[PDB]
């Protein structure tokens with residue numbers, strides 16, 4: 227089973243990424259490129275990327291799956307692009 | 314603690330609903346009204362879903378009596 231509701235805990239604009247509590251002791255890491263457009267509050271330009279602080283808010287929940295398992299001191303690499311048979 | 318990837322096991326036109334194996338022994342019940350438009354075809358349940366396809370669901374009512382959980386694809390997400 228590889229799906230979770232992740233709560234955004236700390237947003238890092240200079241990394242274009244956020245930390246996510248997905249129910250494990252150690253928070254995962256969610257890069258902007260792994261955030262599906264349904265989470266974006268507005269339609270951006272075809273060029274460039276928004277500030278992640280204009281995409282996500284602390285306390286918001288997103289649906290995530292683990293892309294890279296937790297390893298050593300690193301949190302899991304997460305994505306909101308969910309694998310579904312027949313989608 | 315309340316989100317699952319479910320596989321459609323059976324489609325029942327007479328109930329306008331599908332049954333979903335989301336990891337419990339009792340299949341969950343997913344009526345057409347609880348299916349988001351992201352699952353709809355490019356209408357009746359038979360046109361929308363097919364056996365083997367996966368959906369993201371949450372439980373809206375737990376198992377009770379002899380019934381599976383009542384499921385939805387309209388996932389509850391804080392802040393959004």
Ligand SMILES: [Pb+2]
Pocket residue numbers: 259260305
């Ligand atoms: Pb990716």
Ligand SMILES: [Pb+2]
Pocket residue numbers: 272273
């Ligand atoms: Pb252009």
